[PDB]
Design an enzyme around this catalytic site. Sequence first.
Site, PDB file in Angstrom:
ATOM      1  N   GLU E  59       0.817  -1.206   0.000  1.00  0.00           N
ATOM      2  CA  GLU E  59       0.000   0.000   0.000  1.00  0.00           C
ATOM      3  C   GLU E  59       0.852   1.258   0.000  1.00  0.00           C
ATOM      4  OE1 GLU E  59      -2.656   0.555   3.233  1.00  0.00           O
ATOM      5  OE2 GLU E  59      -1.152   1.377   4.597  1.00  0.00           O
ATOM      6  N   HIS E  60       2.112   1.163   0.426  1.00  0.00           N
ATOM      7  CA  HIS E  60       3.043   2.257   0.186  1.00  0.00           C
ATOM      8  C   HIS E  60       3.370   2.368  -1.296  1.00  0.00           C
ATOM      9  CE1 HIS E  60       3.635   2.894   4.457  1.00  0.00           C
ATOM     10  NE2 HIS E  60       4.523   3.836   4.197  1.00  0.00           N
ATOM     11  N   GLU E 136       9.036   5.415   9.485  1.00  0.00           N
ATOM     12  CA  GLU E 136       7.615   5.573   9.771  1.00  0.00           C
ATOM     13  C   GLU E 136       7.219   4.830  11.040  1.00  0.00           C
ATOM     14  OE1 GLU E 136       5.426   7.903   9.134  1.00  0.00           O
ATOM     15  OE2 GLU E 136       5.081   7.451   7.020  1.00  0.00           O
TER      16      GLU E 136
END
Lengths: 102, 49, 53, 60, 445, 379, 55
Positions: E59-60, E136
């Site tokens: 999804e990144h 992150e």
Amino acid sequence: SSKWLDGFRKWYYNAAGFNKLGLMRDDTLHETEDVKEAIRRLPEDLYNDRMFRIKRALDLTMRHQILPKDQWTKYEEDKFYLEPYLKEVIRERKEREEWAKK
Amino acid sequence: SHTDVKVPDFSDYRRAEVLDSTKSSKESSEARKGFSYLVTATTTVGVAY
Amino acid sequence: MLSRFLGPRYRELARNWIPTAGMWGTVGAVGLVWATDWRLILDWVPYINGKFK
Amino acid sequence: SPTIPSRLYSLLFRRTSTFALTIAVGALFFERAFDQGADAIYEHINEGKLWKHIKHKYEN
Amino acid sequence: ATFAQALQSVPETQVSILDNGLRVASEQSSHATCTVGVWIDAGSRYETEKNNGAGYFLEHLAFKGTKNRPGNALEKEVESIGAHLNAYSTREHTAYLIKALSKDLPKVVELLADIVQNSSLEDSQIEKERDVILREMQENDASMQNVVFDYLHATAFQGTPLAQAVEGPSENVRRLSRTDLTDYLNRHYKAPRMVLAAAGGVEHQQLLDLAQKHLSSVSRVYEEDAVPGLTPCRFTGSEIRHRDDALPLAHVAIAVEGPGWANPDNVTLQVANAIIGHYDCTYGGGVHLSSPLASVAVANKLCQSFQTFNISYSDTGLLGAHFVCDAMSIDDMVFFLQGQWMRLCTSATESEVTRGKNILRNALVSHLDGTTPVCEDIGRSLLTYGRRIPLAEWESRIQEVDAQMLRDICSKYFYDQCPAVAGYGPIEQLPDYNRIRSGMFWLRF
Amino acid sequence: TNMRKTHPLFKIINHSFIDLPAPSNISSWWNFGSLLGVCLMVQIITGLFLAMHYTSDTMTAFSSVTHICRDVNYGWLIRYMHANGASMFFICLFLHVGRGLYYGSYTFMETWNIGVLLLFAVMATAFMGYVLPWGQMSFWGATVITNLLSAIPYIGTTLVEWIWGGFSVDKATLTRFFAFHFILPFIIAALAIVHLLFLHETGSNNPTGLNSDADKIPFHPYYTIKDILGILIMFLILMTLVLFFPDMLGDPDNYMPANPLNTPPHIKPEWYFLFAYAILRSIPNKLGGVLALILSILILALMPFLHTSKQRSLMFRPITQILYWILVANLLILTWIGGQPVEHPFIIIGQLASISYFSIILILMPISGIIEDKMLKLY
Amino acid sequence: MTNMRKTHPLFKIINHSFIDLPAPSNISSWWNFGSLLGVCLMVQIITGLFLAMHY
Ligand SMILES: CCCCCCCCCCCCCCCCCC(=O)OC[C@H](COP(=O)(O)OCCN)OC(=O)CCCCCCCCCCCCCCCCC
Ligand code: HEM
Ligand code: HEM
Ligand code: HEM
Ligand code: HEM
């Protein structure tokens, strides 16, 4: 009610005897949650006057003395300073209780 | 990392009916509670006697 | 219900808690006849009456 | 089938008042059973020696 | 107008099935803007602890370019029409959604044509997203609420695929390769697991024609012909406690096992949460809030905030509360919180049930305002229930809850259960597990 | 640094007796409370020196007491200060309870209830101590009041056989009464510790009834020397009551040996029980008399829920002051009637006295409180 | 609403000494003997109380 009830109220005010300690009526009320909240809602001037009158009364009852008769709190000049605050606290407590009933 | 931690293996300690990881609970929880509380109730009966 | 426990909600609390209080009263009565060895009530049961208390 | 401890938990051990009632009734039945069994063990180990075994020659 | 027929006046979601088994659902309203999204049954629960961060990494990379539009050109296709392109991944559902205007409705489907079909994974993007995701998670572990919820899932579902985080551990992030992402896309981005939802100014027939013409080539066929089963997970009553006294105040979450999606008594549990609710230090009501936990928490200044959650998954879930407070009140908060649960098992009266039903009704209608929440509910409902539940059905299910079945359900799920505890911060006064386990029942019952 | 505030044992003494805030205007009546504690210690100390020579046996109890008086060095002194210290203990106890009633001190409900538990314990202790010398009056008073305690159907006869340890009052009753009389003052001392602990969370009351937090003084040195002066005055009264009138409050019939076949013409308890005795025989039913005695002593426990005024003390309530002094007068009349035989006109006077006692405590004082509330224009 | 375990004064005392007392986790069976001495003292009080009723 017209003739002697006011006269009996004056005589009972003299006979009860908190006027000769300089106290007002509402100083003599025993604290509850309602009375403590009503005292907490008082402004600073009336609160300080009440606490000075209370400790003056405790000083006088220490020495088993009373005030001079000209310094006795007069029946007509006796103001009911606390009882609107107390009535508002009682009214909102009754509102909370009747909401908790239903 | 907070994702780097995981609970270590408790298979030396857990009961046989909860050993299987791919079988859901709430099927044997009543039996385990009944066994432990049965031990508690029986020793309470003896102490009361 | 002194002055302000009169309402529908405390009626509902009573209807929820009288069964638990009744079960606790049953516990207390059974414990009373168990501990005191009452002659009236323990003499009805068939099992305990082997020693006749 | 649901197990015997499962029915014991769902029917007796769930609440605390039913737990206490089960403890009281089990204490009654258990003192009856335990007293009879321990007494019977006592005259089986001591046969012919207690007074109850020999109150037949002299009781009449 | 009565609430029931006003709820019936809401337009109905239209659902249809392609030959691939992909579902297409749309809801039409009068808005000039539409929200179109793709929902896939591909979360961290479908992973096997060597691809534990595959969904997050994918999804990144999903907005970084396709095999037809190389990289930033895709960005232009979103940014030259003012559309907002978004994605998220839960432990079970992964969504790629986009908000645009109605006039741009065909072309934007083109983007959802090739985001979930023809993703191109350049290797420079692989190491760039690798160290981006590393920093992150190094940022995300500072947020104590996410740490507490991940700890709660770790200690509640030990040894199961549902314990692991969506992002996964740091060692897999430095170890996922191109072929592993290709295998994850091949196994999990299949045809019957995908729901194309649209909400707002869209028509179902035009959306079906576009959906056919674009997504008629989604796979439906298996790679190794081995169906990935979604097994039951064993809930484990336990605790985890991370003691860090340098932190200013502590986050503590306590949960028990809840039923999931398919069980209707979930709705009853929602009303129970609506009795207890939430409280924050920046509220307005003060001592006069109806929730007794909130009233005692502001009367004694016990907690900074608390909230109640009912998280669900396939035939399982978590049900409980999470509070952040200073250390010196922690156990007292626990005591008060546990007391509220016991009242909901024993002394539930119709006044608070009516209040919780009204709160749940207002929250449920007001949550479904906006094309993005409506599209989210459509996609999540067709992934979970297999159908969209109209709000009139929710109203009928809410209206059947009274106090008796409320305390029956709460005695089923809360009373004498083994909870999962997760603490973080100065949690020395957080009680030992035997004290919480003793607080899960009353001796007066 | 200092041991008064940091040492864990001296911190308790400092918190309870040295830096304790007390109202600056409390009268001499408050000294009575400390006097009660002193009496307890005095009784315990003197009781221990009676126990080094007392023989709990029905053959050798009266003889042992005479040996204490006649052969033990200063043993007459210790025995008569134990007896008159029991009397002074009850005097101080009665004035303590009267201070609690008059100045509205029953609103401290936990302190009031631990108080009435203490009152029950000291009444039972004085009862069994009076049974202990085993004279005529000890035996016959014990037999009379325990046999009327037996009045409960189906339960009371097994309880009185269990209390007596036999068919009637005998050596088992004397020995178990000795054990109970020795051990009860230590439960009394522990309950007095709990009494003081429940008091100190809120502080003492003052005669005006108002909040004394505007003017409070430390307990030391003021109330230290005030209670010392009260102790000295009490010791004047007690030593006058021992060294000059050693048996003015006593009963001469306790100086014969216990003959179980010699029923005295009059049978009385000691004076501090007598009022309850006159409430006992004011009802011609044994269950009614015993239960009425229980209510006559437990109406003190019922008292905090019978308070209706918005004030607390009786200092500004003249009608309720009049009703209180009528109640004290009625209590004095009840003591005199319980001293008197059951003849005319004592039976009707005792009946009206008990009726007026229960009517004044139960009915008339809340009516007077609400009348004074209406009279002060607040209701 | 309050907690009667931590606000009522004698309940506060017994909560400080017996319920919420922070004790070491690793104390062995030799640490049971203080409570054994206390309960044996109580047994001595009760049995001697019943012995002195006839002595
Ligand atoms: C309106 C009254 C006017 C009085 C004026 C007196 C002279 C005034 C000028 C000189 C100054 C003298 C000193 C002033 C003292 C204080 C003010 C005063 O006089 O108060 C009057 C006093 C209290 O006033 P108040 O409470 O209003 O009276 C109600 C009457 N019950 O009330 C009294 O003194 C009356 C007390 C009456 C008590 C009667 C009790 C009868 C029953 C006793 C039963 C006892 C038990 C018996 C046994 C029962 C069983 C058989
Ligand atoms: C066993 C005998 C008793 C002892 C040793 C005892 C001891 C004490 C002591 C030391 C005090 C504090 C000093 C004082 O204020 O006078 C006190 C106060 C008090 N006692 Fe007792 N007491 C006894 C009996 C009772 C009884 C029987 C009652 C109930 C009727 C009672 C109710 C009170 C009350 C209400 C106070 C508070 C005083 C106030 O603030 O006005 N006591 N007691
Ligand atoms: C632990 C402390 C106490 C002990 C060991 C004790 C012991 C005794 C003994 C041995 C006697 C009989 C000797 C005699 O009669 O002269 C006696 C009598 C008596 N005691 Fe105590 N006592 C104690 C406390 C008390 C207390 C607190 C009271 C008051 C309630 C009390 C009231 C009496 C009375 C009234 C008598 C009868 C006096 C008489 O002969 O007329 N005692 N006590
Ligand atoms: C009258 C008999 C005694 C009683 C009832 C008693 C009671 C207790 C109790 C309840 C404890 C706490 C629990 C424990 O640590 O076992 C304790 C601890 C202790 N007692 Fe005693 N004790 C008695 C005799 C003694 C004696 C004679 C000594 C001195 C040699 C002593 C010194 C200690 C010490 C040093 C501790 C603390 C040990 C630790 O914290 O690990 N005790 N006692
Ligand atoms: C206050 C509570 C106590 C009372 C009332 C009490 C009372 C008595 C009595 C009446 C006896 C004589 C009975 C007999 O000797 O057969 C006795 C004996 C004895 N007591 Fe105590 N006692 C108490 C506490 C203790 C304690 C704390 C100890 C020490 C652990 C103790 C040790 C003994 C011993 C060794 C005997 C002799 C037993 C014998 O040889 O028959 N007592 N006690």
